[PDB]
């Protein structure tokens, strides 16, 4: 089961995924160059953004958070318990189990049947060479193009400076000689209307990549190395991992910032066979593009279920209107 | 050199133009080697007569007599192409500077000099041709091309030979 979600969301007072200035009182958000038509030829502009690697890490965090409560949650790595995404790193032979057992770095089938995190998000074992591509692909989050055009520049990244109070046992602040660390560090914050185009394929859950189909008697029999109940639990957990994505658990500095989050609109397409990925909501004319993509792909012979959040998406297209992202994930899991 | 039915025979004559004595002529006599029936298949670079004489002069160490006396070489070839014997090469260049460059080329050592030339001749025939052209006409790029062709296939190209080549460049 492969599902694509793409839409526009509103961010305010966010300091998510900064470069990191270093150690002198300055932290600044990551910025990337994007191209816009701006009715004067294509031009390049710097805008704040959050990388898709961090979004994938947060999806891993959500999946491991929602997978512990499952009865089959013991088949997991303890490294995922502390929300660490190291997987196997460099120069590692045995991966310890959350139950305390150990798993060899070879026999990919054993790895995927014992560790669900590596089964879903992939892994890498340079010592032997076992590999597995991620089943969830994350895209960059960028401010939408029409917002950039209609904001006429006017850089909206604001630098808020604030101090780290260090009061000594005598109630005074001195210098480095007396052992006092008084500093005033600055953090950047941004606002705007961003877009997301998360895509995730769940048809290879529990299926080793080195042997997807068995061909017992020249029939397409999937090579499942785990129990069907465990596979269903894993796919349901991976699907419900989207709950914190569109609620406000994306970004760093959540303890001190917790960005003002709201979902403006989105469109989701779900199916079983391979389907074209939806166009990102960054562009102005993405709703019509997705409408055409759905309309002609349905006529081509693909069984696709379409869900929309307050988007008309044209007419004569069978789509379900969902009032929330959690409603959409409930609709996605009811058909599993 | 045989190469099946046909046969290439390269014949050289060494000629003075100014003055010679007995000792010089016996030094020239030492160059002659009896029964040069090389045949074989791996030693196929005996075609391209200039390469064949370079190979012959590689293993000849009679004397470096002509570094003080002027001498010339007259060469010709004989062919057995389908039992059709004729002479198809009569170019007349000299012999002094080639062996002079070889002799200034081999001061540093022989263990990495003779095998160097042999490997470049056997493996990089095009590289050997570039090297011999560079020796004949003193062009800088020839040495670089020969060294690159040698290194590409199997030649070690030690440091001392590089230093000797640089000293030859001056």
């Amino acid at each position: 089961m492969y599902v694509r979600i793409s839409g526009r969301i509103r961010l305010n007072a966010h300091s998510l995924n900064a470069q990191g200035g270093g150690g002198t009182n300055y932290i600044e958000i990551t910025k990337t160059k994007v191209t816009v038509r701006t009715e004067n030829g294509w031009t390049v502009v710097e805008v704040p953004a959050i990388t898709g690697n961090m979004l994938k890490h947060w999806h891993f965090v959500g999946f491991v958070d929602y997978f512990k409560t499952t009865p089959y949650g013991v088949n997991l790595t303890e490294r995922a318990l502390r929300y660490n995404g190291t997987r196997f790193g460099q120069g590692e032979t045995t991966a310890t189990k959350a139950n305390g057992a150990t798993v060899q770095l070879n026999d990919e089938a054993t790895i995927i049947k014992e560790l669900a995190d590596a089964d879903v998000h992939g892994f890498l074992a340079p010592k032997t060479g076992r590999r597995r591509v991620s089943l969830v692909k994350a895209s960059f989050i960028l401010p939408t193009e029409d917002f950039i055009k209609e904001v006429e520049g006017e850089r909206l990244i604001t630098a808020i400076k604030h101090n780290r109070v260090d009061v000594d046992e005598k109630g005074a602040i001195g210098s480095s000689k007396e052992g006092t660390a008084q500093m005033l560090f600055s953090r950047e914050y941004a606002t705007g209307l961003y877009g997301f185009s998360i895509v995730l394929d769940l048809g290879l859950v529990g299926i080793p990549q080195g042997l997807p189909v068995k061909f017992e008697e020249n029939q397409p029999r999937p090579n499942i190395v785990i129990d069907p109940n465990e596979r269903k639990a894993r796919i349901e957990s991976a699907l419900k991992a989207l709950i914190p994505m569109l609620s406000g658990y994306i970004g760093a500095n959540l303890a001190r910032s917790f960005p003002v989050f709201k979902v403006e609109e989105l469109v989701a397409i779900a199916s079983e066979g391979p389907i074209p990925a939806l166009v990102h909501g960054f562009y102005e004319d993405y709703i019509e593009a997705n409408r055409s993509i759905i309309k002609n792909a349905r006529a081509l012979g693909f069984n696709i279920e379409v869900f929309t959040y307050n988007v008309d998406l044209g007419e004569d297209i069978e789509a379900t209107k969902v009032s929330s992202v959690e409603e959409l994930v409930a609709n996605l899991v009811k058909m599993v | 050199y045989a190469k099946g039915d046909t046969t290439w025979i390269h014949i050289y004559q060494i000629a003075p133009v100014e003055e010679v004595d007995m000792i010089s002529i016996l030094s020239l006599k030492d160059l002659k080697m009896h029964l040069p029936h090389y045949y074989e298949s791996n030693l196929d670079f005996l075609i391209n007569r200039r390469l064949a004489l370079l190979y012959h002069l590689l293993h000849s160490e009679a004397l470096e007599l002509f570094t003080e006396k002027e001498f010339v070489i007259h060469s010709y070839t004989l062919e057995r192409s389908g039992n059709n014997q004729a002479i198809r090469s009569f170019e007349e260049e000299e012999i002094g500077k080639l062996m002079d460059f070889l002799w200034k080329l081999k001061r540093r050592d022989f263990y990495h000099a003779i095998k160097f030339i042999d490997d470049l001749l056997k493996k990089a025939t095009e590289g050997a041709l570039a090297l011999i052209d560079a020796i004949m006409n003193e062009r800088l790029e020839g040495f670089y091309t020969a060294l690159k062709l040698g290194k590409k296939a199997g030649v070690v190209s030690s440091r001392e030979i590089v230093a000797a080549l640089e000293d030859i460049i001056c």
Binding site: - | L147, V162, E166
Partner: protein, 107 residues
């Protein structure tokens, strides 16, 4: 004079022990007409220092020695006066031929 060290550094990019085979840089620097292209070629050749040092450290053999800054300025201070390309050619080919020496680095 300050040619052996740059020769070793350039040969570090050609030896089989370094399975990277950067022949484009040496071919470009060998075929140089005037100052700008040879300077760009030598810059590109010396830009590959971090990967060479990391590969040498991971292999176990001693890391390559980058040419010292003391003779780095020597290249410049000798090269501006070479207005004629002809006398520039001898050094442009000397560096290339020194780049192809054995230079046993990792035993």
């Amino acid at each position: 004079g300050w040619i052996r060290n740059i020769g070793r550094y350039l040969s570090y990019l050609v030896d089989d022990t370094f399975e990277e085979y950067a022949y484009d840089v040496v071919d470009g620097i060998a075929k140089a007409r005037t100052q700008e292209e040879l300077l760009e070629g030598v810059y590109k050749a010396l830009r590959l220092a971090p990967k060479l040092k990391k590969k040498a450290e991971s292999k176990g053999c001693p890391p390559p020695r980058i040419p010292s800054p003391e003779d780095i300025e020597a290249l410049e201070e000798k090269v501006e006066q070479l207005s004629n390309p002809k006398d520039l050619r001898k050094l442009a080919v000397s560096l290339a031929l020194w780049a192809f020496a054995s230079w046993n680095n990792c035993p």
